[PDB]
Design a protein around this ligand. Structure first.
Ligand SMILES: *P(=O)(O)OC[C@H]1O[C@@H](n2cnc3c(N)ncnc32)[C@H](O)[C@@H]1O
Length: 247
DNA sequence: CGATAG
DNA sequence: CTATCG
């Protein structure tokens, strides 16, 4: 119903937090009877897939292995497919009592007595400091992983955006709406130095990633563009914002 | 003054 | 080498 949503990591201290690998699957909320997607609609898996799920809710990601998102998404969006290989990788037991580790223990005992259920408890590792998190992320991207998830253990499960569940990657990518053009200095005078962009993060400039043709023929105001970035600024806006392509 | 993309 | 942002 009310799905706990993750923010992006900005620089908060995470000493004592619980980190895990960020899985590139499909979000699924188990309400004790149905698998509910982020859009609020129920999935339609084969009968017997959820037959050995617990009668209480579970929040997790429908996942199989690395680099398989397209295969997963295609499999779950159908009503004539095989879900073998797809499991619900659980990252919290929404309605249980205690800290994160005590809530997950509830689902762990269910797996003990239901070993053929297609469920997996996501390992949660204790975080020392920011350097440790970057280290864990560093080796995850090496194995082909996508990033790291950081969770405040003592926190509870709440719906909506939360500062206790943060995404951590080395290179993010998003989209924004071009709002304004800014003339460049020196050898970019009379043409584009940076564009103004707008999205859920507010307004900010993008000055890098532009060819010379892009600077002579910049993207129209109101156009949706894509851009990479790593980390955020003290103002709370994308850092190292690099233009990629249009649309 | 430093790091990045062109 | 030259520009953007950090
Ligand atoms: P990315 O921008 O793809 O967003 C990640 C979303 O997936 C959920 N998720 C995947 N894997 C995990 C783990 N291990 N822990 C917590 N959450 C996870 C996030 O909740 C985001 O919805």
């Amino acid at each position: 119903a009310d799905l706990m949503l993750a923010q992006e990591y900005k620089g908060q201290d995470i000493a004592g937090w619980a980190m895990s690998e960020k899985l590139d699957g499909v979000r699924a909320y188990w309400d004790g009877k149905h698998l509910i997607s982020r859009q609020g609609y129920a999935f339609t898996p084969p009968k017997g897939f959820t037959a050995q799920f617990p009668p209480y809710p579970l929040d997790g990601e429908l996942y199989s292995g690395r680099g398989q998102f397209e295969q997963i998404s295609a499999t779950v969006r159908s009503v004539s497919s095989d879900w073998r290989g797809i499991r619900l990788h659980v990252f919290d037991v929404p309605k249980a009592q205690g800290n994160l580790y005590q809530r997950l223990a509830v689902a762990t005992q269910w797996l003990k007595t239901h070993p053929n259920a297609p469920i997996t408890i996501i390992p949660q590792i204790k975080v020392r400091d920011r350097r440790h998190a970057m280290d864990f992320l560093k080796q995850i991207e090496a194995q082909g992983g996508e990033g790291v998830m950081l969770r405040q253990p003592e926190s509870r499960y709440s719906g909506g955006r939360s500062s206790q569940l943060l995404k951590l990657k080395s290179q993010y990518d998003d989209e924004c709406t071009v709002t304004r053009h800014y003339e460049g200095k020196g050898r970019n005078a009379g043409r584009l130095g940076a564009v103004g962009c707008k999205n859920r993060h507010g307004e900010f400039r993008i000055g890098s990633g532009f060819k010379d043709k892009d600077r002579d023929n910049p993207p129209k105001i109101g156009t949706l563009i894509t851009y990479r970035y790593r980390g955020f600024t003290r103002k709370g806006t994308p850092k190292f914002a690099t233009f990629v392509r249009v649309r």
